[PDB]
PDB file of all heavy atoms in Angstrom:
ATOM      1  N   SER A 300      19.633 -42.146  56.842  1.00  0.00           N
ATOM      2  CA  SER A 300      20.621 -41.176  56.386  1.00  0.00           C
ATOM      3  C   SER A 300      21.346 -40.465  57.510  1.00  0.00           C
ATOM      4  O   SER A 300      22.513 -40.104  57.337  1.00  0.00           O
ATOM      5  CB  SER A 300      19.970 -40.123  55.481  1.00  0.00           C
ATOM      6  OG  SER A 300      19.032 -39.332  56.187  1.00  0.00           O
ATOM      7  N   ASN A 301      20.695 -40.261  58.653  1.00  0.00           N
ATOM      8  CA  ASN A 301      21.251 -39.557  59.800  1.00  0.00           C
ATOM      9  C   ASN A 301      21.411 -38.061  59.542  1.00  0.00           C
ATOM     10  O   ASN A 301      21.851 -37.333  60.442  1.00  0.00           O
ATOM     11  CB  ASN A 301      22.605 -40.141  60.230  1.00  0.00           C
ATOM     12  CG  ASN A 301      23.010 -39.709  61.616  1.00  0.00           C
ATOM     13  OD1 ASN A 301      22.168 -39.329  62.430  1.00  0.00           O
ATOM     14  ND2 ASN A 301      24.305 -39.763  61.897  1.00  0.00           N
ATOM     15  N   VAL A 302      21.057 -37.575  58.352  1.00  0.00           N
ATOM     16  CA  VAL A 302      21.198 -36.167  58.001  1.00  0.00           C
ATOM     17  C   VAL A 302      19.899 -35.447  58.321  1.00  0.00           C
ATOM     18  O   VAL A 302      18.819 -35.904  57.929  1.00  0.00           O
ATOM     19  CB  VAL A 302      21.544 -36.010  56.511  1.00  0.00           C
ATOM     20  CG1 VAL A 302      21.644 -34.534  56.129  1.00  0.00           C
ATOM     21  CG2 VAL A 302      22.828 -36.750  56.180  1.00  0.00           C
ATOM     22  N   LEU A 303      19.993 -34.302  59.004  1.00  0.00           N
ATOM     23  CA  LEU A 303      18.834 -33.419  59.110  1.00  0.00           C
ATOM     24  C   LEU A 303      19.093 -32.161  58.287  1.00  0.00           C
ATOM     25  O   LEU A 303      19.842 -31.268  58.725  1.00  0.00           O
ATOM     26  CB  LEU A 303      18.511 -33.073  60.566  1.00  0.00           C
ATOM     27  CG  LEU A 303      17.716 -34.180  61.293  1.00  0.00           C
ATOM     28  CD1 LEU A 303      17.463 -33.813  62.745  1.00  0.00           C
ATOM     29  CD2 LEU A 303      16.376 -34.524  60.610  1.00  0.00           C
ATOM     30  N   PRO A 304      18.527 -32.063  57.088  1.00  0.00           N
ATOM     31  CA  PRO A 304      18.813 -30.937  56.195  1.00  0.00           C
ATOM     32  C   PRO A 304      17.936 -29.739  56.502  1.00  0.00           C
ATOM     33  O   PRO A 304      16.799 -29.875  56.956  1.00  0.00           O
ATOM     34  CB  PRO A 304      18.464 -31.513  54.820  1.00  0.00           C
ATOM     35  CG  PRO A 304      17.325 -32.447  55.101  1.00  0.00           C
ATOM     36  CD  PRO A 304      17.654 -33.066  56.440  1.00  0.00           C
ATOM     37  N   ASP A 305      18.467 -28.547  56.230  1.00  0.00           N
ATOM     38  CA  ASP A 305      17.621 -27.357  56.230  1.00  0.00           C
ATOM     39  C   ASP A 305      17.529 -26.675  54.866  1.00  0.00           C
ATOM     40  O   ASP A 305      16.867 -25.633  54.767  1.00  0.00           O
ATOM     41  CB  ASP A 305      18.083 -26.356  57.296  1.00  0.00           C
ATOM     42  CG  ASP A 305      19.550 -26.023  57.198  1.00  0.00           C
ATOM     43  OD1 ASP A 305      20.164 -26.303  56.150  1.00  0.00           O
ATOM     44  OD2 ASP A 305      20.083 -25.470  58.183  1.00  0.00           O
ATOM     45  N   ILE A 306      18.097 -27.267  53.804  1.00  0.00           N
ATOM     46  CA  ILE A 306      17.979 -26.774  52.435  1.00  0.00           C
ATOM     47  C   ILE A 306      17.548 -27.931  51.535  1.00  0.00           C
ATOM     48  O   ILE A 306      18.065 -29.042  51.674  1.00  0.00           O
ATOM     49  CB  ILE A 306      19.330 -26.197  51.949  1.00  0.00           C
ATOM     50  CG1 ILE A 306      19.785 -25.070  52.876  1.00  0.00           C
ATOM     51  CG2 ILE A 306      19.215 -25.726  50.494  1.00  0.00           C
ATOM     52  CD1 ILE A 306      21.321 -24.894  52.923  1.00  0.00           C
ATOM     53  N   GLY A 307      16.621 -27.674  50.606  1.00  0.00           N
ATOM     54  CA  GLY A 307      16.236 -28.665  49.603  1.00  0.00           C
ATOM     55  C   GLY A 307      16.506 -28.129  48.212  1.00  0.00           C
ATOM     56  O   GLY A 307      16.490 -26.914  47.987  1.00  0.00           O
ATOM     57  N   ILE A 308      16.798 -29.035  47.271  1.00  0.00           N
ATOM     58  CA  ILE A 308      17.045 -28.637  45.890  1.00  0.00           C
ATOM     59  C   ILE A 308      16.297 -29.562  44.933  1.00  0.00           C
ATOM     60  O   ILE A 308      16.237 -30.778  45.136  1.00  0.00           O
ATOM     61  CB  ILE A 308      18.557 -28.586  45.549  1.00  0.00           C
ATOM     62  CG1 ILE A 308      19.176 -29.976  45.504  1.00  0.00           C
ATOM     63  CG2 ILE A 308      19.294 -27.717  46.565  1.00  0.00           C
ATOM     64  CD1 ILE A 308      20.589 -29.977  44.918  1.00  0.00           C
ATOM     65  N   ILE A 309      15.744 -28.970  43.872  1.00  0.00           N
ATOM     66  CA  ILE A 309      15.122 -29.707  42.765  1.00  0.00           C
ATOM     67  C   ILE A 309      15.717 -29.184  41.468  1.00  0.00           C
ATOM     68  O   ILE A 309      15.581 -27.995  41.155  1.00  0.00           O
ATOM     69  CB  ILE A 309      13.563 -29.554  42.764  1.00  0.00           C
ATOM     70  CG1 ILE A 309      12.956 -30.029  44.091  1.00  0.00           C
ATOM     71  CG2 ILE A 309      12.978 -30.325  41.578  1.00  0.00           C
ATOM     72  CD1 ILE A 309      11.449 -29.747  44.261  1.00  0.00           C
ATOM     73  N   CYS A 310      16.418 -30.041  40.718  1.00  0.00           N
ATOM     74  CA  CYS A 310      17.158 -29.579  39.550  1.00  0.00           C
ATOM     75  C   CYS A 310      16.454 -29.954  38.252  1.00  0.00           C
ATOM     76  O   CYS A 310      15.850 -31.027  38.072  1.00  0.00           O
ATOM     77  CB  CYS A 310      18.593 -30.107  39.497  1.00  0.00           C
ATOM     78  SG  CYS A 310      19.453 -29.896  41.024  1.00  0.00           S
ATOM     79  N   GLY A 311      16.565 -29.054  37.268  1.00  0.00           N
ATOM     80  CA  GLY A 311      15.938 -29.263  35.972  1.00  0.00           C
ATOM     81  C   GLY A 311      16.622 -30.286  35.082  1.00  0.00           C
ATOM     82  O   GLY A 311      17.678 -30.810  35.431  1.00  0.00           O
ATOM     83  N   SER A 312      16.027 -30.558  33.917  1.00  0.00           N
ATOM     84  CA  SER A 312      16.527 -31.601  33.025  1.00  0.00           C
ATOM     85  C   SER A 312      17.909 -31.241  32.502  1.00  0.00           C
ATOM     86  O   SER A 312      18.089 -30.164  31.932  1.00  0.00           O
ATOM     87  CB  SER A 312      15.565 -31.782  31.849  1.00  0.00           C
ATOM     88  OG  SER A 312      14.279 -32.175  32.307  1.00  0.00           O
ATOM     89  N   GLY A 313      18.882 -32.139  32.703  1.00  0.00           N
ATOM     90  CA  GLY A 313      20.265 -31.894  32.297  1.00  0.00           C
ATOM     91  C   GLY A 313      21.043 -30.992  33.234  1.00  0.00           C
ATOM     92  O   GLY A 313      22.204 -30.658  32.946  1.00  0.00           O
ATOM     93  N   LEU A 314      20.445 -30.606  34.356  1.00  0.00           N
ATOM     94  CA  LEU A 314      21.030 -29.644  35.290  1.00  0.00           C
ATOM     95  C   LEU A 314      21.317 -30.244  36.668  1.00  0.00           C
ATOM     96  O   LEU A 314      21.387 -29.504  37.658  1.00  0.00           O
ATOM     97  CB  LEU A 314      20.098 -28.439  35.429  1.00  0.00           C
ATOM     98  CG  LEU A 314      19.702 -27.784  34.096  1.00  0.00           C
ATOM     99  CD1 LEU A 314      18.697 -26.648  34.353  1.00  0.00           C
ATOM    100  CD2 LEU A 314      20.930 -27.284  33.305  1.00  0.00           C
ATOM    101  N   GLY A 315      21.515 -31.558  36.761  1.00  0.00           N
ATOM    102  CA  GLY A 315      21.657 -32.213  38.047  1.00  0.00           C
ATOM    103  C   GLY A 315      23.074 -32.585  38.455  1.00  0.00           C
ATOM    104  O   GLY A 315      23.237 -33.309  39.442  1.00  0.00           O
ATOM    105  N   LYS A 316      24.099 -32.106  37.754  1.00  0.00           N
ATOM    106  CA  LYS A 316      25.470 -32.516  38.073  1.00  0.00           C
ATOM    107  C   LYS A 316      25.833 -32.221  39.530  1.00  0.00           C
ATOM    108  O   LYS A 316      26.587 -32.978  40.155  1.00  0.00           O
ATOM    109  CB  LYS A 316      26.463 -31.825  37.144  1.00  0.00           C
ATOM    110  CG  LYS A 316      27.894 -32.336  37.333  1.00  0.00           C
ATOM    111  CD  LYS A 316      28.924 -31.529  36.546  1.00  0.00           C
ATOM    112  CE  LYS A 316      30.330 -32.113  36.699  1.00  0.00           C
ATOM    113  NZ  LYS A 316      30.780 -32.230  38.123  1.00  0.00           N
ATOM    114  N   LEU A 317      25.339 -31.113  40.083  1.00  0.00           N
ATOM    115  CA  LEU A 317      25.679 -30.773  41.467  1.00  0.00           C
ATOM    116  C   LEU A 317      25.380 -31.915  42.433  1.00  0.00           C
ATOM    117  O   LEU A 317      26.119 -32.117  43.406  1.00  0.00           O
ATOM    118  CB  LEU A 317      24.922 -29.516  41.900  1.00  0.00           C
ATOM    119  CG  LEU A 317      25.143 -29.041  43.348  1.00  0.00           C
ATOM    120  CD1 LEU A 317      26.601 -28.721  43.615  1.00  0.00           C
ATOM    121  CD2 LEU A 317      24.299 -27.824  43.625  1.00  0.00           C
ATOM    122  N   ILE A 318      24.312 -32.676  42.181  1.00  0.00           N
ATOM    123  CA  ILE A 318      23.914 -33.755  43.087  1.00  0.00           C
ATOM    124  C   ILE A 318      25.007 -34.817  43.184  1.00  0.00           C
ATOM    125  O   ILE A 318      25.139 -35.490  44.213  1.00  0.00           O
ATOM    126  CB  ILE A 318      22.564 -34.355  42.626  1.00  0.00           C
ATOM    127  CG1 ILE A 318      21.478 -33.270  42.604  1.00  0.00           C
ATOM    128  CG2 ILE A 318      22.134 -35.517  43.531  1.00  0.00           C
ATOM    129  CD1 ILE A 318      20.123 -33.721  42.018  1.00  0.00           C
ATOM    130  N   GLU A 319      25.819 -34.975  42.141  1.00  0.00           N
ATOM    131  CA  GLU A 319      26.871 -35.986  42.160  1.00  0.00           C
ATOM    132  C   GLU A 319      28.062 -35.601  43.030  1.00  0.00           C
ATOM    133  O   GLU A 319      28.925 -36.451  43.277  1.00  0.00           O
ATOM    134  CB  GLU A 319      27.362 -36.265  40.739  1.00  0.00           C
ATOM    135  N   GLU A 320      28.143 -34.356  43.495  1.00  0.00           N
ATOM    136  CA  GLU A 320      29.251 -33.927  44.336  1.00  0.00           C
ATOM    137  C   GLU A 320      28.801 -33.640  45.766  1.00  0.00           C
ATOM    138  O   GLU A 320      29.569 -33.073  46.551  1.00  0.00           O
ATOM    139  CB  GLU A 320      29.952 -32.708  43.715  1.00  0.00           C
ATOM    140  CG  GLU A 320      29.437 -31.326  44.146  1.00  0.00           C
ATOM    141  CD  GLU A 320      30.381 -30.197  43.757  1.00  0.00           C
ATOM    142  OE1 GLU A 320      31.436 -30.044  44.416  1.00  0.00           O
ATOM    143  OE2 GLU A 320      30.071 -29.461  42.796  1.00  0.00           O
ATOM    144  N   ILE A 321      27.577 -34.025  46.128  1.00  0.00           N
ATOM    145  CA  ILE A 321      27.164 -33.945  47.523  1.00  0.00           C
ATOM    146  C   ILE A 321      28.118 -34.788  48.357  1.00  0.00           C
ATOM    147  O   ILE A 321      28.440 -35.927  47.997  1.00  0.00           O
ATOM    148  CB  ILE A 321      25.701 -34.397  47.669  1.00  0.00           C
ATOM    149  CG1 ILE A 321      24.782 -33.410  46.950  1.00  0.00           C
ATOM    150  CG2 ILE A 321      25.287 -34.510  49.151  1.00  0.00           C
ATOM    151  CD1 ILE A 321      23.347 -33.895  46.773  1.00  0.00           C
ATOM    152  N   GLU A 322      28.589 -34.223  49.468  1.00  0.00           N
ATOM    153  CA  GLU A 322      29.598 -34.865  50.298  1.00  0.00           C
ATOM    154  C   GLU A 322      28.964 -35.812  51.309  1.00  0.00           C
ATOM    155  O   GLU A 322      27.865 -35.562  51.816  1.00  0.00           O
ATOM    156  CB  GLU A 322      30.430 -33.815  51.032  1.00  0.00           C
ATOM    157  CG  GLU A 322      31.361 -33.023  50.145  1.00  0.00           C
ATOM    158  CD  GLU A 322      32.221 -32.051  50.943  1.00  0.00           C
ATOM    159  OE1 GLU A 322      31.756 -30.919  51.209  1.00  0.00           O
ATOM    160  OE2 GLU A 322      33.351 -32.428  51.321  1.00  0.00           O
ATOM    161  N   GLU A 323      29.676 -36.902  51.598  1.00  0.00           N
ATOM    162  CA  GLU A 323      29.236 -37.906  52.567  1.00  0.00           C
ATOM    163  C   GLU A 323      27.767 -38.236  52.359  1.00  0.00           C
ATOM    164  O   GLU A 323      26.954 -38.193  53.284  1.00  0.00           O
ATOM    165  CB  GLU A 323      29.500 -37.434  53.994  1.00  0.00           C
ATOM    166  CG  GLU A 323      30.983 -37.431  54.353  1.00  0.00           C
ATOM    167  CD  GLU A 323      31.258 -36.796  55.697  1.00  0.00           C
ATOM    168  OE1 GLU A 323      30.404 -36.023  56.181  1.00  0.00           O
ATOM    169  OE2 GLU A 323      32.331 -37.068  56.266  1.00  0.00           O
ATOM    170  N   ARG A 324      27.434 -38.561  51.118  1.00  0.00           N
ATOM    171  CA  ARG A 324      26.049 -38.572  50.690  1.00  0.00           C
ATOM    172  C   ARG A 324      25.405 -39.926  50.943  1.00  0.00           C
ATOM    173  O   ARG A 324      26.073 -40.934  51.208  1.00  0.00           O
ATOM    174  CB  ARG A 324      25.944 -38.193  49.211  1.00  0.00           C
ATOM    175  CG  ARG A 324      26.368 -39.262  48.246  1.00  0.00           C
ATOM    176  CD  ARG A 324      26.568 -38.682  46.848  1.00  0.00           C
ATOM    177  NE  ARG A 324      26.649 -39.727  45.825  1.00  0.00           N
ATOM    178  CZ  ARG A 324      25.920 -39.770  44.711  1.00  0.00           C
ATOM    179  NH1 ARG A 324      25.043 -38.818  44.423  1.00  0.00           N
ATOM    180  NH2 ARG A 324      26.082 -40.776  43.863  1.00  0.00           N
ATOM    181  N   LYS A 325      24.076 -39.918  50.902  1.00  0.00           N
ATOM    182  CA  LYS A 325      23.276 -41.128  50.986  1.00  0.00           C
ATOM    183  C   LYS A 325      22.192 -41.055  49.925  1.00  0.00           C
ATOM    184  O   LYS A 325      21.445 -40.068  49.866  1.00  0.00           O
ATOM    185  CB  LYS A 325      22.659 -41.297  52.376  1.00  0.00           C
ATOM    186  CG  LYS A 325      21.727 -42.499  52.492  1.00  0.00           C
ATOM    187  CD  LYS A 325      22.460 -43.826  52.250  1.00  0.00           C
ATOM    188  CE  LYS A 325      21.471 -44.941  51.962  1.00  0.00           C
ATOM    189  NZ  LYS A 325      22.035 -46.298  52.187  1.00  0.00           N
ATOM    190  N   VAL A 326      22.109 -42.107  49.109  1.00  0.00           N
ATOM    191  CA  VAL A 326      21.201 -42.192  47.965  1.00  0.00           C
ATOM    192  C   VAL A 326      20.052 -43.134  48.318  1.00  0.00           C
ATOM    193  O   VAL A 326      20.282 -44.311  48.632  1.00  0.00           O
ATOM    194  CB  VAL A 326      21.951 -42.683  46.714  1.00  0.00           C
ATOM    195  CG1 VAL A 326      21.019 -42.781  45.516  1.00  0.00           C
ATOM    196  CG2 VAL A 326      23.113 -41.768  46.409  1.00  0.00           C
ATOM    197  N   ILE A 327      18.814 -42.639  48.225  1.00  0.00           N
ATOM    198  CA  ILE A 327      17.635 -43.422  48.599  1.00  0.00           C
ATOM    199  C   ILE A 327      16.644 -43.487  47.442  1.00  0.00           C
ATOM    200  O   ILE A 327      15.950 -42.492  47.179  1.00  0.00           O
ATOM    201  CB  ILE A 327      16.938 -42.825  49.835  1.00  0.00           C
ATOM    202  CG1 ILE A 327      17.956 -42.596  50.955  1.00  0.00           C
ATOM    203  CG2 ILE A 327      15.830 -43.746  50.305  1.00  0.00           C
ATOM    204  CD1 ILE A 327      17.372 -41.974  52.196  1.00  0.00           C
ATOM    205  N   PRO A 328      16.513 -44.617  46.753  1.00  0.00           N
ATOM    206  CA  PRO A 328      15.521 -44.701  45.673  1.00  0.00           C
ATOM    207  C   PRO A 328      14.112 -44.447  46.191  1.00  0.00           C
ATOM    208  O   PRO A 328      13.720 -44.946  47.250  1.00  0.00           O
ATOM    209  CB  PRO A 328      15.687 -46.134  45.149  1.00  0.00           C
ATOM    210  CG  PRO A 328      17.088 -46.506  45.516  1.00  0.00           C
ATOM    211  CD  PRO A 328      17.359 -45.828  46.820  1.00  0.00           C
ATOM    212  N   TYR A 329      13.347 -43.659  45.425  1.00  0.00           N
ATOM    213  CA  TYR A 329      11.966 -43.384  45.801  1.00  0.00           C
ATOM    214  C   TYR A 329      11.231 -44.679  46.114  1.00  0.00           C
ATOM    215  O   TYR A 329      10.437 -44.741  47.059  1.00  0.00           O
ATOM    216  CB  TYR A 329      11.217 -42.655  44.680  1.00  0.00           C
ATOM    217  CG  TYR A 329      11.712 -41.283  44.306  1.00  0.00           C
ATOM    218  CD1 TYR A 329      11.393 -40.744  43.053  1.00  0.00           C
ATOM    219  CD2 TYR A 329      12.477 -40.524  45.180  1.00  0.00           C
ATOM    220  CE1 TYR A 329      11.820 -39.474  42.684  1.00  0.00           C
ATOM    221  CE2 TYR A 329      12.925 -39.253  44.808  1.00  0.00           C
ATOM    222  CZ  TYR A 329      12.588 -38.737  43.557  1.00  0.00           C
ATOM    223  OH  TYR A 329      13.030 -37.488  43.167  1.00  0.00           O
ATOM    224  N   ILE A 330      11.474 -45.727  45.324  1.00  0.00           N
ATOM    225  CA  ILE A 330      10.686 -46.942  45.463  1.00  0.00           C
ATOM    226  C   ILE A 330      10.836 -47.557  46.845  1.00  0.00           C
ATOM    227  O   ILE A 330       9.962 -48.321  47.272  1.00  0.00           O
ATOM    228  CB  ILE A 330      11.077 -47.970  44.370  1.00  0.00           C
ATOM    229  CG1 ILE A 330      10.113 -49.164  44.386  1.00  0.00           C
ATOM    230  CG2 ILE A 330      12.508 -48.447  44.578  1.00  0.00           C
ATOM    231  CD1 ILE A 330      10.113 -49.983  43.094  1.00  0.00           C
ATOM    232  N   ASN A 331      11.943 -47.276  47.545  1.00  0.00           N
ATOM    233  CA  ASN A 331      12.153 -47.824  48.884  1.00  0.00           C
ATOM    234  C   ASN A 331      11.476 -47.019  50.001  1.00  0.00           C
ATOM    235  O   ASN A 331      11.431 -47.509  51.140  1.00  0.00           O
ATOM    236  CB  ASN A 331      13.648 -47.901  49.205  1.00  0.00           C
ATOM    237  CG  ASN A 331      14.390 -48.893  48.328  1.00  0.00           C
ATOM    238  OD1 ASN A 331      13.820 -49.869  47.834  1.00  0.00           O
ATOM    239  ND2 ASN A 331      15.672 -48.647  48.138  1.00  0.00           N
ATOM    240  N   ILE A 332      10.964 -45.817  49.733  1.00  0.00           N
ATOM    241  CA  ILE A 332      10.510 -44.932  50.811  1.00  0.00           C
ATOM    242  C   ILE A 332       9.010 -45.089  51.027  1.00  0.00           C
ATOM    243  O   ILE A 332       8.239 -44.892  50.073  1.00  0.00           O
ATOM    244  CB  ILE A 332      10.808 -43.452  50.509  1.00  0.00           C
ATOM    245  CG1 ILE A 332      12.302 -43.205  50.304  1.00  0.00           C
ATOM    246  CG2 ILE A 332      10.271 -42.553  51.656  1.00  0.00           C
ATOM    247  CD1 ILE A 332      12.636 -41.795  49.819  1.00  0.00           C
ATOM    248  N   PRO A 333       8.549 -45.381  52.246  1.00  0.00           N
ATOM    249  CA  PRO A 333       7.108 -45.556  52.465  1.00  0.00           C
ATOM    250  C   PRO A 333       6.316 -44.343  51.998  1.00  0.00           C
ATOM    251  O   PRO A 333       6.667 -43.195  52.281  1.00  0.00           O
ATOM    252  CB  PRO A 333       6.995 -45.742  53.983  1.00  0.00           C
ATOM    253  CG  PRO A 333       8.336 -46.220  54.418  1.00  0.00           C
ATOM    254  CD  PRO A 333       9.325 -45.586  53.489  1.00  0.00           C
ATOM    255  N   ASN A 334       5.220 -44.609  51.277  1.00  0.00           N
ATOM    256  CA  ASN A 334       4.257 -43.624  50.786  1.00  0.00           C
ATOM    257  C   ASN A 334       4.782 -42.712  49.676  1.00  0.00           C
ATOM    258  O   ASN A 334       4.065 -41.811  49.248  1.00  0.00           O
ATOM    259  CB  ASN A 334       3.702 -42.757  51.928  1.00  0.00           C
ATOM    260  CG  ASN A 334       2.956 -43.578  52.961  1.00  0.00           C
ATOM    261  OD1 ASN A 334       2.239 -44.516  52.619  1.00  0.00           O
ATOM    262  ND2 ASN A 334       3.180 -43.277  54.237  1.00  0.00           N
ATOM    263  N   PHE A 335       5.994 -42.916  49.170  1.00  0.00           N
ATOM    264  CA  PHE A 335       6.429 -42.098  48.034  1.00  0.00           C
ATOM    265  C   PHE A 335       5.691 -42.554  46.765  1.00  0.00           C
ATOM    266  O   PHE A 335       5.287 -43.718  46.646  1.00  0.00           O
ATOM    267  CB  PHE A 335       7.964 -42.197  47.856  1.00  0.00           C
ATOM    268  CG  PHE A 335       8.722 -40.931  48.276  1.00  0.00           C
ATOM    269  CD1 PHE A 335       8.668 -40.438  49.579  1.00  0.00           C
ATOM    270  CD2 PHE A 335       9.498 -40.242  47.355  1.00  0.00           C
ATOM    271  CE1 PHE A 335       9.352 -39.248  49.938  1.00  0.00           C
ATOM    272  CE2 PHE A 335      10.174 -39.068  47.700  1.00  0.00           C
ATOM    273  CZ  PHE A 335      10.120 -38.582  48.998  1.00  0.00           C
ATOM    274  N   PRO A 336       5.476 -41.653  45.805  1.00  0.00           N
ATOM    275  CA  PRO A 336       4.668 -42.021  44.635  1.00  0.00           C
ATOM    276  C   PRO A 336       5.366 -43.056  43.768  1.00  0.00           C
ATOM    277  O   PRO A 336       6.593 -43.074  43.670  1.00  0.00           O
ATOM    278  CB  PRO A 336       4.496 -40.694  43.882  1.00  0.00           C
ATOM    279  CG  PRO A 336       5.474 -39.765  44.461  1.00  0.00           C
ATOM    280  CD  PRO A 336       5.800 -40.217  45.844  1.00  0.00           C
ATOM    281  N   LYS A 337       4.560 -43.923  43.144  1.00  0.00           N
ATOM    282  CA  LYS A 337       5.073 -44.919  42.201  1.00  0.00           C
ATOM    283  C   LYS A 337       5.473 -44.232  40.895  1.00  0.00           C
ATOM    284  O   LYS A 337       4.673 -43.498  40.311  1.00  0.00           O
ATOM    285  CB  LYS A 337       4.017 -45.994  41.935  1.00  0.00           C
ATOM    286  CG  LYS A 337       4.445 -47.101  40.969  1.00  0.00           C
ATOM    287  CD  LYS A 337       3.420 -48.257  40.970  1.00  0.00           C
ATOM    288  CE  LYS A 337       3.654 -49.255  39.845  1.00  0.00           C
ATOM    289  NZ  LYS A 337       4.932 -50.025  39.982  1.00  0.00           N
ATOM    290  N   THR A 338       6.711 -44.476  40.424  1.00  0.00           N
ATOM    291  CA  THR A 338       7.237 -43.768  39.256  1.00  0.00           C
ATOM    292  C   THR A 338       7.726 -44.721  38.166  1.00  0.00           C
ATOM    293  O   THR A 338       8.432 -44.294  37.247  1.00  0.00           O
ATOM    294  CB  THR A 338       8.373 -42.810  39.653  1.00  0.00           C
ATOM    295  OG1 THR A 338       9.515 -43.545  40.101  1.00  0.00           O
ATOM    296  CG2 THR A 338       7.934 -41.888  40.778  1.00  0.00           C
TER     297      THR A 338
END
């Protein structure tokens, strides 16, 4: 991603629209990330 963030967000059910307007964004499926939980 090349991004070093200093803010994190977790949005509730039906409340995630803000995530779709993140600028210059990078989307990473959990399944691709080492040691992330199986979902």
Side-chain angles (χ1 to χ4, degrees), residues 300-318 320-338:
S300 65
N301 196 22
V302 178
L303 279 178
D305 52 16
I306 302 152
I308 70 169
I309 303 172
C310 311
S312 299
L314 307 176
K316 186 188 183 304
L317 179 60
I318 301 174
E320 91 166 285
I321 294 168
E322 289 183 274
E323 289 173 339
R324 75 195 194 128
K325 176 62 197 200
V326 180
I327 309 178
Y329 296 159
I330 188 161
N331 294 333
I332 301 172
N334 298 321
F335 253 60
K337 181 170 169 67
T338 67

